[PDB]
């Protein structure tokens, strides 16, 4: 996260960390959507151009965390993946269209003040909240600059009009992607950055006061560049795939 602030404690209790076992390192963020299901970006798991193709055993997930590097004893929980499911039509060859994946944990994670799932949207939640100007919130432990934060960072960024997104880039934008960010004229700034990929873009419904996850941090051309925006997986467009995967392979 570029230009954020420090998260408060339990502010983002769905925030998960995708953590490599060997060497020990942050890869991506992710989000807790049930007691045994974590949501992340497909490119955190599979991105062939960079020889990235993880299995369940290469990775750990860390839920309950605030501090990036420290082992938060009595607070965080660390989980082993039991299965990865990459969206079958995730386009790594072109533009990261359908940049979504699920991970089934080996055992259900126990909730607490620091650990609590986020909601996924319905058709009505999306209709109502995915509108240009409406702000969501992005969280992560990624770089503060295009250096690294002690604790989890937060930034609130406005959803940007569709035309404005396409015209900021030569990459082909699809319906499964929205972009967010301030314009050079709006004065405020902020963006996701390296290591933040996979993490949640969420919005608090004004109707029921529940946090829903509308996007997944998916890509951008640099971090916090004027006239450029970060792109997010449109989580509601790919949710029938989410439910499908959970309805079949879940317990």
């Amino acid at each position: 996260i570029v230009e954020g602030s420090d998260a408060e404690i339990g502010m983002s209790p769905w925030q998960v960390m995708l953590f490599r076992k060997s060497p020990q390192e942050l890869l991506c963020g992710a989000s807790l959507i049930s007691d045994r299901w974590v949501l992340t970006a497909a490119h955190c798991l599979l991105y062939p151009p960079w020889d990235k193709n993880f299995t369940e055993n290469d990775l750990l997930v860390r839920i309950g965390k605030h501090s990036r590097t420290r082992y938060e004893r009595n607070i965080e929980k660390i989980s082993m993946l039991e299965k990865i499911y990459i969206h079958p039509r995730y386009n790594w060859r072109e533009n990261l269209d359908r940049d979504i994946a699920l991970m089934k944990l080996k055992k259900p994670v126990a909730f607490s003040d620091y650990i609590h799932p986020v909601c996924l949207p319905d058709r009505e939640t999306a209709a109502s909240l995915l509108q240009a100007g409406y702000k969501g919130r992005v969280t992560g432990w990624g770089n503060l600059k295009e250096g690294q934060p002690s604790v989890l960072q937060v930034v609130n960024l406005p959803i940007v009009e569709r035309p404005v997104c396409k015209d900021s880039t030569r990459i082909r934008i699809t319906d499964n992607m929205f972009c967010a960010g301030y314009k050079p004229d709006e004065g405020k700034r902020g963006d996701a950055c390296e290591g933040d990929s996979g993490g949640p873009f969420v919005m608090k419904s004004p109707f029921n006061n529940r946090w829903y996850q509308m996007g997944i941090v998916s890509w951008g051309e640099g971090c916090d560049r004027d006239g450029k925006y970060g792109f997010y997986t449109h989580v509601f467009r790919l949710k029938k795939w989410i439910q499908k995967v959970i309805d079949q392979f879940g317990e």
């Binding site: 959507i33 702000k135 004004p206 006061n209 529940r210």
Partner: peptide, 29 residues
């Protein structure tokens, strides 16, 4: 959706607000 999803124990459950969620609300116009 899970019955209790998206309500955080240190905030919604206790009826406390975090420092910038009003920035999000103020934008839902």
């Amino acid at each position: 959706g899970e019955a209790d999803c998206g309500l955080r124990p240190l905030f919604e459950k206790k009826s406390l607000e975090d420092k910038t969620e009003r920035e999000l609300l103020e934008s839902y116009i």
